[PDB]
Design a protein around this ligand. Structure first.
Ligand SMILES: CC(C)[C@H](NC(=O)[C@H](C)NC(=O)OCc1ccccc1)C(=O)N[C@@H](Cc1ccccc1)[C@@H](O)[C@H](O)[C@@H](Cc1ccccc1)NC(=O)[C@@H](NC(=O)[C@H](C)NC(=O)OCc1ccccc1)C(C)C
Ligand SMILES: O=C(O)Cc1cc2ccccc2s1
Lengths: 99, 99
């Protein structure tokens, strides 16, 4: 698609046979979701944003589909108000910014 | 231009006649820049991110060039760690996500 930005760029994703919604976020280095039962154990990680820093759970090798585009990578679970697809996955679907 | 997302999408901007570097951020509703003075009157605002809220000064109708592309709009100023161009200005330059 070619997605204009007059509203938040929310798209449908699929993770572990659950459809969710998430934000295509070029200002995010990593991908951050609020929840899921991603397979078991996790490693702690720090991430920062505008307000300061937060601890997240890092899960590796996570299969995710973004508008039907298959991808695999690291997904953080943390206190984000919106699910965030960051650059680590945006690159895998060949997402570019254009103007 | 067409910008891939293997690294942070930093671009040259010009504001108040000075060149700066800023992150093109589809995940930002608003544009937030490092402390500077701008023309006109500002009003106080709080904006939320990962980590919580910060206080910023909102300036309206500020001219900015993003890679040479003119945009006029609200710019917030305050203690951000990175200059962020958000959707309010991305839409003015006809920036789109593509995959
Ligand atoms: C989501 C994070 C992965 C991302 N951070 C990062 O990628 C970074 C730098 N990486 C990173 O942490 O790497 C690992 C690391 C960290 C530290 C040390 C060593 C290694 C990020 O916060 N990115 C933000 C920009 C930024 C970049 C660098 C440094 C500081 C800020 C926006 O892109 C971004 O996409 C959105 C994500 C988002 C959306 C909505 C809510 C919360 C977060 N956030 C924003 O912070 C923008 N907010 C919004 O557009 C508004 C207005 N917010 C909003 O709706 O807030 C509601 C809310 C707030 C709080 C609680 C509940 C609701 C802001 C830039 C204007
Ligand atoms: O004091 C200043 O110079 C600047 C600001 C104060 C304030 C208070 C609440 C919300 C935003 C802002 S900006």
């Amino acid at each position: 698609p070619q997605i204009t930005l007059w509203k938040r760029p929310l798209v449908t994703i699929k993770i572990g046979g659950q459809l969710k919604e998430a934000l295509l976020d070029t200002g995010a280095d990593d991908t951050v979701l609020e929840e899921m039962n991603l397979p078991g154990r996790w490693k702690p990680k720090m991430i920062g944003g505008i307000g300061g820093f937060i601890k997240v759970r890092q899960y590796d090798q996570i299969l995710i589909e973004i508008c039907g585009h298959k991808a695999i990578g690291t997904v953080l679970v943390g206190p984000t108000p919106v699910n965030i697809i960051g650059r680590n996955l945006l690159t895998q679907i060949g997402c570019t910014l254009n103007f």
